[PDB]
Coordinates of C-alpha atoms and ligand atoms in Angstrom, one line a residue:
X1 CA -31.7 5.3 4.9
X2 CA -28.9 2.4 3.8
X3 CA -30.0 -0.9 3.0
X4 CA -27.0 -3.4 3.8
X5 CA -26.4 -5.6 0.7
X6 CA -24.3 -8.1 1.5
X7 CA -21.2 -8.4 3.5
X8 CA -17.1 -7.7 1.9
X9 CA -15.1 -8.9 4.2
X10 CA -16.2 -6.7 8.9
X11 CA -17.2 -4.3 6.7
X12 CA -20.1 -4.4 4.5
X13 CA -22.0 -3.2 1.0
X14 CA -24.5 -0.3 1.7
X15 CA -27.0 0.9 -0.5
X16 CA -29.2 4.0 -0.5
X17 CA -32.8 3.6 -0.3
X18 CA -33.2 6.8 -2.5
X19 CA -30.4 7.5 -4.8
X20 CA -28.9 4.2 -4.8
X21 CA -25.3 5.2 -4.4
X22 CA -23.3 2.8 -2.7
X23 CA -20.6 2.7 -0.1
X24 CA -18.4 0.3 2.4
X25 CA -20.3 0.5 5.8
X26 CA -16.9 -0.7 8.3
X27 CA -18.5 -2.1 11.9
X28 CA -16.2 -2.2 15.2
X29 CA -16.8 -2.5 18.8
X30 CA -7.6 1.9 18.3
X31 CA -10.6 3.0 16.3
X32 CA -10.6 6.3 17.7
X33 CA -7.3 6.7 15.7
X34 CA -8.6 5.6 12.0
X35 CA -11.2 7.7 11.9
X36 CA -9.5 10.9 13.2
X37 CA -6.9 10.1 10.4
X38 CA -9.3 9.4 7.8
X39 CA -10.7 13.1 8.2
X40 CA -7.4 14.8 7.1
X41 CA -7.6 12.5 4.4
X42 CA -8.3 13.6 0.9
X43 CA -7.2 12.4 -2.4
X44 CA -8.3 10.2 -5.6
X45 CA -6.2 7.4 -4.6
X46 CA -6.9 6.7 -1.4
X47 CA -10.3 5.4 -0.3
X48 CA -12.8 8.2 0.8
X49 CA -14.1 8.8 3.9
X50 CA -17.8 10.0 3.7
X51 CA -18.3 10.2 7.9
X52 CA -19.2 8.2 11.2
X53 CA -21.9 7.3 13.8
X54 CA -21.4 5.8 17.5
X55 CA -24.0 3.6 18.5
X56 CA -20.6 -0.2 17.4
X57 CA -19.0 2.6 15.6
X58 CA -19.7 2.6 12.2
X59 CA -17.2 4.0 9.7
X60 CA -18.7 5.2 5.9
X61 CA -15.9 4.9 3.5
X62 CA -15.6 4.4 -0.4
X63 CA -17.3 1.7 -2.3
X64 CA -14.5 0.2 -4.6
X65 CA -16.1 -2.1 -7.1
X66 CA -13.2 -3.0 -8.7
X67 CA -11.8 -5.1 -5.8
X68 CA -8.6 -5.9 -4.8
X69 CA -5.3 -5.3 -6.8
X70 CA -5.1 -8.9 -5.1
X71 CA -7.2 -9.9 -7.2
X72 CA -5.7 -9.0 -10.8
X73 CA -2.6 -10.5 -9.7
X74 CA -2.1 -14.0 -11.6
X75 CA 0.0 -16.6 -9.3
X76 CA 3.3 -17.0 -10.7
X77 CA 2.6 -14.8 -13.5
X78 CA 1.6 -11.6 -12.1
X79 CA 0.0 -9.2 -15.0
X80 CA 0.7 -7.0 -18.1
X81 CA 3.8 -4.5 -17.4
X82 CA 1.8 -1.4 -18.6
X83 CA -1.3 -2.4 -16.2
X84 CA 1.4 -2.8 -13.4
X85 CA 3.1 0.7 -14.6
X86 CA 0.3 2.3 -14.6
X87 CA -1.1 1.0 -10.8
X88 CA 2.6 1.8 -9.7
X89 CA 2.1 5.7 -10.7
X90 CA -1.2 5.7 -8.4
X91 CA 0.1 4.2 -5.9
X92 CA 2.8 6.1 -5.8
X93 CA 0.2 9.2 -6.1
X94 CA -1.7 8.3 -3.1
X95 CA 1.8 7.6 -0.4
X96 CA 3.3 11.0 -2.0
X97 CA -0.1 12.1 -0.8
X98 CA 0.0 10.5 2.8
X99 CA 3.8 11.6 3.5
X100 CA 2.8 14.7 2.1
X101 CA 0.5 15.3 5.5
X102 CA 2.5 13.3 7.7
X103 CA 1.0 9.9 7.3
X104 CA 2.4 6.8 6.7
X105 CA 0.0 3.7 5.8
X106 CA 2.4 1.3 7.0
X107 CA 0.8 -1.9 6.0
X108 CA 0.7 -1.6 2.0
X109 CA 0.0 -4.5 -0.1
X110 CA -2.4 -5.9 -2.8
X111 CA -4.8 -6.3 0.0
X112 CA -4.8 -3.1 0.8
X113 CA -4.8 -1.4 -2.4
X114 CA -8.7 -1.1 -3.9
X115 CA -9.8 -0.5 -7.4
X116 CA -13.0 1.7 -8.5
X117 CA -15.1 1.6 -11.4
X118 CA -12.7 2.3 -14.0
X119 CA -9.5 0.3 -12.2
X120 CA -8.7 3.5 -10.3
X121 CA -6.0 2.2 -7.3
X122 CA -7.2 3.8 -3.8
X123 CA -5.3 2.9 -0.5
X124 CA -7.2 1.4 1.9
X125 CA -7.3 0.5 5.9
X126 CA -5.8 3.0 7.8
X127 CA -5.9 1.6 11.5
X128 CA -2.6 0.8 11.1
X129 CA -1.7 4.3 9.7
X130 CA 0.2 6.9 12.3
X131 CA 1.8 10.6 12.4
X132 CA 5.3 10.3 11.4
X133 CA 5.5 14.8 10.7
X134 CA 3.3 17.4 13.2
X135 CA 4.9 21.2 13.2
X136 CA 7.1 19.9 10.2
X137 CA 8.9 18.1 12.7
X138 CA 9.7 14.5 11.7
X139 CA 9.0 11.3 14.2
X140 CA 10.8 8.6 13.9
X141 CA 8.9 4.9 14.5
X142 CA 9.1 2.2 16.8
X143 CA 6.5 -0.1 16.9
X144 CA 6.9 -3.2 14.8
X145 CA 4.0 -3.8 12.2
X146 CA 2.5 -4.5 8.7
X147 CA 2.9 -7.4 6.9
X148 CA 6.5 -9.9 6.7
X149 CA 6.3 -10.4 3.4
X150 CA 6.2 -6.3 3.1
X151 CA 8.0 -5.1 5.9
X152 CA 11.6 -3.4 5.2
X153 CA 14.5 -4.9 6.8
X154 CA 15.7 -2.3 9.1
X155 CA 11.9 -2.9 10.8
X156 CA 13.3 -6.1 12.1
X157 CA 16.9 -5.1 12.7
X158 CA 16.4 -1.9 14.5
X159 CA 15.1 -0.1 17.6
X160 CA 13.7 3.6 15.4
X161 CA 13.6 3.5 12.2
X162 CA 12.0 6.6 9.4
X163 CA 9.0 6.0 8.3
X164 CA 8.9 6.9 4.4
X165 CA 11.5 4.1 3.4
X166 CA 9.1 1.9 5.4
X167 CA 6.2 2.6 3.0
X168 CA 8.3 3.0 -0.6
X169 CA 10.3 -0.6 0.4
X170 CA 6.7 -1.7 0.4
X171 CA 5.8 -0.5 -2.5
X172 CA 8.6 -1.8 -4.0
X173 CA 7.6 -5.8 -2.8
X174 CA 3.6 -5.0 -4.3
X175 CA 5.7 -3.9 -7.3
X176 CA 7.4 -7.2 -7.5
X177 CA 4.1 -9.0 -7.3
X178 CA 2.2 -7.3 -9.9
X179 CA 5.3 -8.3 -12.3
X180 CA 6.0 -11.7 -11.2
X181 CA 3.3 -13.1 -9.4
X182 CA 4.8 -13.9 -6.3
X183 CA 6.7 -12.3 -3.5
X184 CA 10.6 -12.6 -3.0
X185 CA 10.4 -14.1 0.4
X186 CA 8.8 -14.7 3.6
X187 CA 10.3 -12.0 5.2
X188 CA 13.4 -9.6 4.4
X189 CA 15.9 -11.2 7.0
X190 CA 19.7 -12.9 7.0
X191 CA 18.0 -16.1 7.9
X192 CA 16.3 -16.4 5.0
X193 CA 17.7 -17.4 1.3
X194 CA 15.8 -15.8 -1.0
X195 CA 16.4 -12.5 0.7
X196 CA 19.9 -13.6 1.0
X197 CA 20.2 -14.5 -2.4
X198 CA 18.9 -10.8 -3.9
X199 CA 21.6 -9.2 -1.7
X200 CA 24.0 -11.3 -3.3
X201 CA 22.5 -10.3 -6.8
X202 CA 21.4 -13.7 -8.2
X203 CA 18.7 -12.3 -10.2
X204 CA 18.8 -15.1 -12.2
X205 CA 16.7 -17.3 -10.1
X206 CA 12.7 -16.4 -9.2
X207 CA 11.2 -14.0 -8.8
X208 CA 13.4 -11.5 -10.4
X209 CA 13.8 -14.0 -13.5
X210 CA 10.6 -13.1 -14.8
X211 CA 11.2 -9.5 -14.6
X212 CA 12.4 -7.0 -17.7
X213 CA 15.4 -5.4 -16.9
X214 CA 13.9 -1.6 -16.7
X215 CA 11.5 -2.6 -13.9
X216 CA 14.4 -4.4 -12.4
X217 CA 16.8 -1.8 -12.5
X218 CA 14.4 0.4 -10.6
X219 CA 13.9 -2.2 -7.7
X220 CA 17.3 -2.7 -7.5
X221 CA 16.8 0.9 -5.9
X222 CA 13.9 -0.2 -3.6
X223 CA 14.5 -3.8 -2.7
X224 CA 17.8 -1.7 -0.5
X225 CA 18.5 -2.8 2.8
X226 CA 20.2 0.5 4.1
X227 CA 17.0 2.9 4.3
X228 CA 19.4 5.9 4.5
X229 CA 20.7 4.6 0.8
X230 CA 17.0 3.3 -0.4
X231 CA 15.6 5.4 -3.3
X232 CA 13.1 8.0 -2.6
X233 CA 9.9 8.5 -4.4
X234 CA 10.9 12.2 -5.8
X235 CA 13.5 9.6 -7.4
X236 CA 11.6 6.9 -8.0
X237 CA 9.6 9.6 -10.0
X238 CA 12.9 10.3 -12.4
X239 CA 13.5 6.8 -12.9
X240 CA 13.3 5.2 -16.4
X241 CA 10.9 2.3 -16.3
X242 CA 8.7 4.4 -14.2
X243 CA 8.7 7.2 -17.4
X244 CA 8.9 4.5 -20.4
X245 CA 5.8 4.8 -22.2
X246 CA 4.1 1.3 -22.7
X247 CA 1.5 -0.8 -24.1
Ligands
YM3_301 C1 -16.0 -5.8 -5.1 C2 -15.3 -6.1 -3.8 O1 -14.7 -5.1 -3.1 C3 -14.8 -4.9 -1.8 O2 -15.1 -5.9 -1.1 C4 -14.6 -3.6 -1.1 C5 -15.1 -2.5 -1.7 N1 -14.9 -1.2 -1.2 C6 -14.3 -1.1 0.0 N2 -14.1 0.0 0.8 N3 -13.4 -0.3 1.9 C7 -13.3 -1.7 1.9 C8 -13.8 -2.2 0.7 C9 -14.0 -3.5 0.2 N4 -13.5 -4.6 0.9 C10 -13.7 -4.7 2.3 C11 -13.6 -6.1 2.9 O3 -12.4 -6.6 2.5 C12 -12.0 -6.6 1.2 C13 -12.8 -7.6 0.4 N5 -12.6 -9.0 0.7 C14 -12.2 -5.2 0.6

């Protein structure tokens, strides 16, 4: 028996009446979807999936105390570079994870990455989430979604597009935030100027100004419009910020 606490955000805080463990209780009444991908699902960085009931469907998934990574981002300042490091190598832990099984979040942002206990980033909110690899036989996307200020360019520009430089150009923009406290620009297209001005390298201006040159040098790689050229995460792995050792 759960006693519901109070409500997250619908989701809501659930409490055993015996052992007092917690979890996030998730109420809908698409759907069919999230929960059949949350059962392949398994790993310490993405948010667990204990089970469901159908009454309303109810979805059990991992209590995150910690919050959002939203949340430990200061506007305009962003946080310490060996906190943001360190939430980078989890993230990236947890979509090496999802790609590894075929799986792309497609929606990643602050929002949607969760903290534990001891600041332990899990990736959250998989209705979004699709097979991009079945029979080791890669998919290739067509649907537009996720979130402008995260979505790759080649999401607006073409008609398929891969689905791994989807998810590792978003990491890339969360990466941005945690280090500068803002994002680059309302959305990555030739209409706008601030995405205009990073293709023509003026890294002088905001948000990039803020920015050591290490980290910079790595999203120089990510931030790339071509996703055929864009950087892949067993690279982004051999990359130098990514192994300096800080703090
Ligand atoms: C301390 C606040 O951590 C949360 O609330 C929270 C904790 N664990 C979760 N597992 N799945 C979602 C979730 C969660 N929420 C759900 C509602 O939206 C977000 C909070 N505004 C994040």
């Amino acid at each position: 028996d759960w006693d519901l606490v109070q409500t997250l955000g619908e989701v809501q805080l659930a409490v055993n009446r015996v052992t007092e463990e917690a979890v996030a209780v998730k109420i809908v009444d698409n759907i069919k979807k999230e929960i059949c991908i949350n059962k392949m699902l398994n790993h310490e960085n993405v948010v667990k999936f204990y089970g469901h009931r159908r009454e309303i469907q109810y979805l059990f998934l991992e209590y995150c105390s910690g919050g959002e990574l939203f949340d430990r981002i200061e506007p305009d300042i962003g946080m310490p570079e060996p906190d943001a490091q360190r939430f980078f190598h989890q993230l990236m832990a947890g979509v090496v994870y999802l790609h590894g099984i075929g799986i792309t979040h497609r929606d990643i942002k602050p929002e949607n990455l969760l903290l534990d206990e001891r600041d332990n980033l899990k990736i959250s909110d998989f209705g979004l989430a699709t097979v991009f690899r079945y029979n080791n036989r890669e998919r290739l996307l067509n649907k537009m979604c996720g979130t402008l200020p995260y979505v790759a360019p080649e999401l607006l520009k073409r008609r398929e597009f891969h689905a791994e430089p989807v998810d590792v150009w978003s990491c890339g923009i969360v990466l941005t935030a945690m280090l500068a406290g803002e994002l680059p620009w309302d959305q990555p297209s030739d209409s706008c100027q601030e995405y205009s001005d990073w293709k023509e390298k003026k890294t002088y201006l905001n948000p990039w100004k803020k920015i050591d040159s290490a980290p910079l040098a790595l999203l120089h790689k990510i931030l790339v419009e071509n996703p055929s050229a864009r950087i892949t995460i067993p690279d982004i792995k051999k990359d130098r910020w990514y192994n300096k050792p800080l703090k």
